[PDB]
Design a protein around this ligand. Structure first.
Ligand SMILES: C[C@@H](O)CCCC(=O)CCC/C=C/c1cc(O)cc(O)c1C(=O)O
Ligand SMILES: C[C@@H](O)CCCC(=O)CCC/C=C/c1cc(O)cc(O)c1C(=O)O
Ligand SMILES: C[C@@H](O)CCCC(=O)CCC/C=C/c1cc(O)cc(O)c1C(=O)O
Ligand SMILES: C[C@@H](O)CCCC(=O)CCC/C=C/c1cc(O)cc(O)c1C(=O)O
Lengths: 305, 304, 309, 299
């Protein structure tokens, strides 16, 4: 297995399509009847469009569904030195403008949920009808957050190992060294990656993603407080498992109760309807671990826009 | 300037468009059936930096001149100033207002953004770009080639950051003039004046911060942008030199930096025209409008 | 205001002032007590000069040979543009002990001075220190990217931002009017406290580049607190004064959180030293100045127990 | 990985670290302190020590991160420099003449400006990357246009405290580098001196943290002892525009101007045919230059 050669991809239930956005090619898949309201699905970090493979089938009964590979992931362009929230987000603006061509409901998981909120605030006018942020690391994914734990006290331990042992565009590729260091890590999420083989979704991932989160450059020019304070559409914030590790004090999960509270206050001050669904027993990737439950929450909220 | 009530009338009516995050102010001139042109001002310059050249270009072109975010009547956006946000604003402006392929001309930092659009616009948006005295590399904190911003315009930016401040929150013009008067940078000493120039009153000095601190282009290194340009490019290179007292760069970019930038743009496969005008000021479109429009029209006429 | 930028602001105090050339800088200091008694070094809080301790020095001089110092960028000590770092502050103090005190010392520091006392416990030359008192120290909370809890941006950072912008490096801006306007609009109670009664004398002696390097996270970039605390080599007393959470912002009030204190104590315990912890939640952060008798009581009680059995 | 050498080795506790060193010559003669280049141990000077020990009391040291303590997250010019201040005060206990090669010569200048008063009689800066080892220098080429390419490969393929240790991947990338210095490191086995090196050294130079709080122009403008600056091979690579050698002629001029304004005697010796480690590749030549200059210092 050689992720650096980008020859790792496998079949999926929907055909894969590509669009030139200008700087990058973005790979995506499509499901459902084009006469239905459009939905855009943005995956979690290290997740490709097919992170949503099962939920797409359920959602396609009611919506025209697009799921995308972000730059640095899947079959989309890898762009050294270019990974930032603003480049991710403007990629998605161009996708909506060039491919979807009608208003969309956007759902994103974790960093994808950060980008869904990015679009709510910063898309072109009228591109969006509402957004679902699925377990988003508001503040918790920033190096210098306005509120609560930083990324160094949450997912950063994992990103540090990715940066060191996998490297930009898999330039190091030391899977054995990664597993050795991960098995001895204080992060339960880090220890979770130790395996004989490389998970498929991680084979498709550009680990420079991890560098820009760990080093705090990905969001340097996009502070979360200013983004959250400027959303322009309804927002559903889903909040899954979270807790504090007694051994280290680090955050477990995507964001703390305090970070969720401050994020909700910020979006409420922007003048939009903010719904909050707390599912403390769910994994962060509910759209994949509990697809029917996720689609139930999604469709309930989508119907009331 | 902090209250943003300083604006005055101009030879053209001003229009505003909602791009999403920001409102963009601009002016329009010429016949809607002529080829479209987009003019991007230098740093601290509003759209009306191009007022004279617009008149001359409007005989042949449908001309748009814009205020970038943090300038003029466009939105001020604290903590958001980066090349990619400037650039994508302009992508949106072309898509929502111009709605036709455009020829883009940009002065200094506007010319960096002209090259940004050449490489990173949506497909087919651009026919070609004129980069008027662009500080390739020299406006970066850590350039691949040649002088850094700290050895170029950085001394000016340090003074703006310290004495004017983000969104004019400090606004110590007397303290700025005192310090600029004692600066080794000739460009800094050129701002000493009793009153605040009109263009600078409209300017958000957080601009100077993000250039001085190296954050504006952190996720947009110039060598990767220059190596991915996709349209014909005309690079005009105006006055430049070395100050013996400091070794600092005078002008927008050195001959070495122009050479390395042209090599990258050539490696991207595009036709790069290089016009060296070592007598001209960096803002030739304003100091010598007819000469600027001649160079522009000569080159634009030859585009497919 | 230009007087602070010209550094002609200094006034007399209760003790005469002395200077020593440490190499890069001149360090100003005051001395009290019997040279026959055990030596003590007092390190002020940020914006505080040696005379922050003036009253406590009188009380301590009864039983100790007391030295109180101006750090670089403060008081009459050298202002050093672009050189403000925990390592440069700390090595200044190492040289002061070596060149002036010439005896083992008990070190007591307030807030950032307490961070520097811990620095010395870990990183001084061998045998220079017998123990350190860390008076309300912002362990982790004065860092831009701490291992644990609140960052400086969620604590004292709002004050440092206003100092950086309106006072400026070496007081080059000096916009006190603008500072007060912005401060009166600030959510930080510490920020608002600086407005009344003009520019405090201690602040006029202060180089606000201090505030820049804390706000920008450069002061301790090469000196992470977790590695410092895990390598202390002397007994440590940590006094923990007022602290809480502001409901309006979630920001820390005080020097460090109870979580940060716990994690700091755990690291110092793992270093193999005796760690004492005294919680005084009703005290201001500068207890040595606001309640000198109470401070000297804590100090002397603990210093007595440093005596070998 | 450490091996025997021609001189016995000693260790001293400086506080945070233990410092390894070797000592040679008559303890009655004037003291000399030798600081290696980056990735160099004290025995970088082994042959030069023999020659110098006939007239001088010679000390050669391992800096932190090179048998001296490795100290993760603590590598900075000021921590390097204060280590040496402590070594002089605790070990040498007499004024010293200091010679340092490349980054060691940066530290020799550091000591001239920032040591404790009177610790130093003079410094020799052997091919020092003044400015050129900084991320944002006041003058000339930055580290990214000089030795940076090498440091980037060390950071990625070797890693902090050799935590990655992908020597094969390093050799592959180095052999294909446009930097001749990088290409020079390719070898089937790890050189002994590099086995002794903490590559977090390379990280802090590449990332510009090593000297963040120690800008070179303020250091050079505050030197307090005589300075000898030796300037070896240097040039421009036409393919990249990058600097070859330690510093440019422009950077040497700007450094000399600052040291002149500091108020000290500055001597400049241009040897454009010499490699940067003249004390190792041409020891007799190096000791001739040093012994001449040191004899002119006030006894
Ligand atoms: C490599 C990646 O799988 C590690 C993050 C997953 C995890 O910790 C589980 C708790 C949820 C945190 C998510 C999260 C947090 C971030 O700070 C950034 C992210 O992109 C995610 C993100 O997953 O996109
Ligand atoms: C007006 C002042 O605030 C900007 C500097 C003017 C000057 O030095 C004249 C020489 C040309 C370099 C310009 C320039 C250089 C940069 O590094 C960045 C810029 O935005 C410009 C820029 O003007 O956009
Ligand atoms: C006075 C002003 O300049 C600093 C504001 C101090 C304050 O909030 C009082 C509560 C305790 C925090 C202290 C503290 C905290 C830091 O992060 C850094 C410090 O140097 C101190 C420090 O005071 O040295
Ligand atoms: C990794 C090591 O090989 C360094 C590269 C040596 C080299 O290019 C030839 C000599 C010119 C530059 C030296 C130099 C330059 C720096 O910027 C920093 C250094 O520590 C040295 C230094 O060697 O100490």
């Amino acid at each position: 297995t050689s992720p650096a050669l980008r020859d790792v991809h496998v079949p999926h239930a929907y055909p894969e399509q590509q669009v030139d956005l200008g700087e990058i090619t973005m790979n995506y898949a499509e499901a459902g009847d084009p006469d239905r309201p459009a939905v855009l699905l943005i995956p979690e970090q290290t997740g490709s469009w097919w992170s949503y493979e099962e939920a797409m089938g359920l959602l396609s009964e009611h919506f025209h569904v697009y799921a995308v590979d972000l730059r640095g992931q899947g079959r989309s362009s890898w762009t050294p030195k270019r990974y930032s929230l603003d480049n991710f987000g403007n990629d998605l603006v161009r996708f909506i403008a060039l491919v979807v061509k009608r208003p969309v409901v956007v759902a994103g998981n974790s960093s994808g949920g950060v980008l869904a909120a990015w679009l709510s605030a910063y898309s072109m006018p009228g591109q969006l009808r509402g957004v679902l942020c699925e377990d988003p690391p508001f503040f918790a994914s920033e190096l210098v957050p306005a509120h609560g734990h930083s990324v160094r006290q949450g997912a950063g331990p994992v990103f540090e190992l990715f940066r060191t042992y996998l490297g930009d565009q898999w330039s190091v590729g030391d899977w054995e060294g990664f597993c050795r260091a991960a098995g001895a890590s204080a992060s339960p999420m880090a220890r979770s990656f130790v395996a004989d083989g490389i998970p498929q979704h991680l084979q498709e991932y550009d680990p420079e993603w991890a560098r820009v989160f760990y080093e705090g450059t990905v969001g340097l020019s996009c502070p979360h407080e200013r983004m959250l304070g400027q959303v322009k559409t309804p927002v559903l914030l889903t909040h899954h498992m979270r807790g504090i590790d007694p051994e280290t004090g680090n955050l477990l999960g995507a964001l703390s109760d305090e970070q969720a509270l401050r994020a909700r206050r910020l979006m409420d001050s922007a003048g939009v309807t903010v719904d909050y669904e707390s599912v403390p027993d769910a994994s962060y990737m509910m759209h994949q671990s509990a697809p029917a439950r996720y689609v139930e929450i999604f469709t309930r909220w989508a119907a009331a826009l």
